[PDB]
Design a protein around this ligand. Structure first.
Ligand SMILES: *[C@@H]1O[C@H](CO)[C@@H](O[C@@H]2O[C@H](CO)[C@@H](O)[C@H](O)[C@H]2NC(C)=O)[C@H](O)[C@H]1NC(C)=O
Ligand SMILES: *[C@@H]1O[C@H](CO)[C@@H](O[C@@H]2O[C@H](CO)[C@@H](O)[C@H](O)[C@H]2NC(C)=O)[C@H](O)[C@H]1NC(C)=O
Ligand SMILES: *[C@@H]1O[C@H](CO)[C@@H](O)[C@H](O)[C@H]1NC(C)=O
Ligand SMILES: *[C@@H]1O[C@H](CO)[C@@H](O)[C@H](O)[C@H]1NC(C)=O
Ligand SMILES: *[C@@H]1O[C@H](CO)[C@@H](O)[C@H](O)[C@H]1NC(C)=O
Ligand SMILES: *[C@@H]1O[C@H](CO)[C@@H](O)[C@H](O)[C@H]1NC(C)=O
Ligand SMILES: *[C@@H]1O[C@H](CO)[C@@H](O)[C@H](O)[C@H]1NC(C)=O
Lengths: 49, 36, 193, 48, 118, 48
């Protein structure tokens, strides 16, 4: 109502909105580190054609 | 150009339909299928 | 209307089919409502009562408003005047592609409206049917009075109907039977005016 | 089939100087008329 | 307000015919009115006349209309057939009988002359 | 319904004066009612 005074009646407010408790992360379990040296540290690169 | 309307009974009765092409004579023309 | 005769914009617009369908549904409801309005207004009576066979109503002249069997329509003189006063704008119901393409050097309103996907549907009831309904109402209210609106129609002389109506407003019916000539002349003068 | 709609049954009425039709019997009729009075009341949460 | 709490004289407002009474019933998001009305059914043909001349003076019916069995004359109400004998307390006199178009010749019974005669 | 199929006792509903009868006529997208009514003209003074 943007005011400090409210008339007699019944009013509607926001729905029952519930806050979360914790946070979780679920990623597939992979241990290997794929080659950053066979793509960026190679000795011979192909032509553009 | 030209409106098209479809007249049909319920689909649980038959699949035959009629097509009404607005703003055109029939007395080919601009129709999907002349038929009969 | 939005991007007719274009392919890429149709693919972009495919995400507004709900809006387009809702607009079309609203327009269809409007048209159905208008047809229902006309049907409800003009089809109160169901039996097409023929025009009176003989004309001895007592001096009253109804040839001014009754239909004349001389033109392809059942419109009387007053109806013809009323039709002649107001001018329509839809310009009939048929406008072929060979005609809008003919007047490409001259500007037109209906052709531009139709090329952008804005069409006008024809009314369900034609003017001849409405004229028939009005003629039936006139015949019922002249030959049978108000009894044709409540069940079957009962025959009654017109002078007696006028006496009934005068008795309705608190005037004795001897006034009519002693002044029928003057009342008929006044009614004819009023209809002429 | 496609046809032209009918404007109801067709008949006429007899009229003369002194011909009057007067009822002798009657009938009591019951008719149904349905009228909506209200619709469903609804509320919308803007943010939600 | 107008058809349940009273009787309506408006034509074709609450059911066809002459309105007699009405009943309300509820319905989900609506109301249903049962209108009980009166409809004349069996019409009969008759010959009629606006007024009659008896002693040079016209007689007009108070309520109803003049009808004829073919040889006799009666006065009856307007929505039903209850013929009655023409008499002075059913008609009223208004002037002479040479101005009205369609008048007919008939006698009128007086309910006082036979009483005084005896 | 109320002025063509019957006689109306409602004041100033169908034409000024006392309503006697009415006639319907058609018009493009509309209707035209000709109301025939009764109007007293020549008043006279009296003591009562
Ligand atoms: C008026 O109409 C009603 C019905 O149309 C007649 O009532 C019928 O009379 C016969 C014999 O008495 C019965 O077998 C029927 O069952 C009645 N019909 C109903 C619906 O009740 C009545 O006879 C008629 N009155 C006159 C004077 O003709
Ligand atoms: C009703 O009664 C009167 C009186 O009997 C009839 O008036 C007479 O009519 C004839 C011919 O028109 C005249 O010669 C008489 O002079 C009239 N007599 C009077 C007192 O006016 C009248 O004709 C009768 N009505 C009908 C239709 O016959
Ligand atoms: C790339 O190769 C050089 C020598 O071959 C090495 O010094 C450097 O650490 C390498 N960098 C990465 C990201 O492997
Ligand atoms: C009254 O007159 C007409 C013409 O003779 C006739 O058809 C009609 O049947 C008569 N009315 C009744 C109820 O018989
Ligand atoms: C008509 O009604 C009267 C009164 O009952 C009667 O005397 C007369 O015989 C009837 N005439 C016919 C043709 O029915
Ligand atoms: C009744 O109408 C017919 C035909 O117009 C006519 O012969 C007769 O004179 C009329 N009678 C009256 C009283 O109007
Ligand atoms: C009735 O009284 C007033 C006052 O005298 C007068 O002006 C009026 O003209 C009288 N009514 C008529 C119709 O003359």
């Amino acid at each position: 109502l943007k005011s400090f005074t409210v008339e007699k009646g019944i009013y509607q407010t926001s729905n029952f909105r519930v806050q979360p408790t914790e946070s979780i992360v679920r990623f597939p379990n992979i241990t290997n580190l794929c080659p950053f040296g066979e793509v960026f540290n190679a000795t011979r690169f192909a032509s553009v054609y | 150009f030209g409106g098209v309307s479809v007249i049909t009974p319920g689909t649980n009765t038959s699949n035959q339909v009629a097509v009404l092409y607005q703003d055109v004579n029939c007395t080919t023309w601009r129709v999907y299928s002349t038929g009969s | 209307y939005i991007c007719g005769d274009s392919t890429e914009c149709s693919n972009l617009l495919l995400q507004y089919g709900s809006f387009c369908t809702q607009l079309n549904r609203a327009l269809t409801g409007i048209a159905v409502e208008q047809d229902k309005n006309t049907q409800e207004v003009f089809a109160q009576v169901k039996q097409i009562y023929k025009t009176p066979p003989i004309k001895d109503f007592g001096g009253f002249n109804f040839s001014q408003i009754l239909p004349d069997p001389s033109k392809p329509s059942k419109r009387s003189f007053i109806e013809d005047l009323l039709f002649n006063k107001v001018t329509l704008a839809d310009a009939g119901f048929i406008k072929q592609y060979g005609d809008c393409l003919g007047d490409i050097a001259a500007r037109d309103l209906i052709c531009a409206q139709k090329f952008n996907g804005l069409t006008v549907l024809p009314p369900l009831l034609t003017d001849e049917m409405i004229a028939q309904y009005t003629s039936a109402l006139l015949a019922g209210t002249i030959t049978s009075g108000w009894t044709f609106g409540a069940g079957a129609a009962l025959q009654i002389p017109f002078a007696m109907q006028m006496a009934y109506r005068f008795n309705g407003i608190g005037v004795t019916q001897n006034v009519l039977y002693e002044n029928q000539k003057l009342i008929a002349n006044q009614f004819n003068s009023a209809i002429g005016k | 089939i496609a046809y032209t709609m009918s404007l109801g049954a067709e008949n006429s009425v007899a009229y003369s100087n002194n011909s009057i039709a007067i009822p002798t019997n009657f009938t009591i009729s019951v008719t149904t008329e349905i009228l909506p009075v209200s619709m469903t009341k609804t509320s919308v949460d803007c943010t939600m | 307000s107008e058809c349940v709490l009273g009787q309506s004289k408006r034509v074709d407002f609450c059911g066809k015919g002459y309105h007699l009474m009405s009943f309300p019933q509820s319905a989900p998001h609506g109301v249903v009115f049962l209108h009980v009305t009166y409809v004349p059914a069996q019409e009969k043909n008759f010959t009629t006349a606006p007024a009659i001349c008896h002693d040079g003076k016209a007689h007009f019916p108070r309520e109803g209309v003049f009808v004829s069995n073919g040889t006799h004359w009666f006065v009856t109400q307007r929505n039903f057939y209850e013929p009655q004998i023409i008499t002075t307390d059913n008609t009223f006199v208004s002037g002479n009988c040479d101005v009205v178009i369609g008048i007919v010749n008939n006698t009128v019974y007086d309910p006082l002359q036979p009483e005084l005669d005896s």
